[PDB]
């Protein structure tokens, strides 16, 4: 008859599929090139994780030109977007914090602040 | 490295933001029009949830054998909200769309009821 059902592992499963598409460049409408290093991603996932990309792809206005401080910092930001996990080291936290601050991703900023305070 | 930061509520947040995009017709490259009603979606989300849409998007370039908009609506609601609402008025319409798109997680859900 009538019933409602919830699949708690569905969000993580879709994100893992979105990650595998990105690692293989499948259905990717966005490609970043930072000094030879390339990064393919989905514009819908970028706008879902970063308010900067939201105002760049959706609102199309009132956005400062893209500025990526470190290529390795951008890879960790995209890795967090598609895996919800972010590896942080005392030799890369500042580079990840630079890209995250420009992209207005307070979740990574809080994660970077957690490592410098809770080493 | 020396530490790994995990965000358990991230994938739920991404799916909710993707749902808000398809509900507002934002950053969507798909448009389902079945019996006069329009449905927006992302081709990357469809391939991530349906093996039929996967093969249709990673290998191929459309008319679908979708019986009714109500069954497609609830199927799209499951993709973007992880929740499936079934009632005796739509369980047959949902299973029809679920079997064509080859999503046995939904197929088994309605096979019981």
């Amino acid at each position: 008859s009538m019933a409602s059902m919830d699949f708690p592992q569905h969000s993580q499963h879709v994100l893992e599929q979105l990650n595998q598409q990105r690692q293989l460049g499948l259905l990717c409408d966005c490609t970043f090139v930072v000094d030879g290093v390339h990064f393919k991603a989905h514009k819908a996932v970028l706008a879902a994780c970063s308010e900067y990309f939201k105002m760049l792809f959706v609102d199309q206005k009132d956005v400062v030109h893209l500025d990526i401080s470190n290529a390795a910092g951008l890879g960790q930001v995209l890795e967090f977007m598609y895996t919800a996990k972010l590896s942080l080291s005392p030799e890369n936290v500042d580079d990840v914090l630079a890209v995250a601050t420009f992209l207005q991703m307070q979740d990574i900023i809080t994660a970077c602040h957690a490592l410098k305070s809770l080493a | 490295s020396m530490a790994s930061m995990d965000f358990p509520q991230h994938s739920q947040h991404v799916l909710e933001q993707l749902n808000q995009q398809r509900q507002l017709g934002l950053l969507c490259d798909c448009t389902f029009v079945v019996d006069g009603v329009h449905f927006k979606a992302h081709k990357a989300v469809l391939a991530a949830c349906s093996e039929y849409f996967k093969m249709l998007f990673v290998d191929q370039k459309v008319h679908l054998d979708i019986s009714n908009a109500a069954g497609l609506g609830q199927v799209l609601e499951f993709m973007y909200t992880a929740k499936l609402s079934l009632s005796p008025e739509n369980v047959d319409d949902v299973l029809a769309v679920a079997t064509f798109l080859q999503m046995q997680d939904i197929i088994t859900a309605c096979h019981a009821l």
Partner: peptide
């Protein structure tokens, strides 16, 4: 009994030099 309109896909490339001053 159904239509699926797919918008054409053009790739958005963003080529940037790193600002590691």
């Amino acid at each position: 009994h159904a239509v699926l309109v797919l918008q054409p896909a053009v790739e958005a490339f963003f080529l940037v030099h790193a600002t590691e001053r």
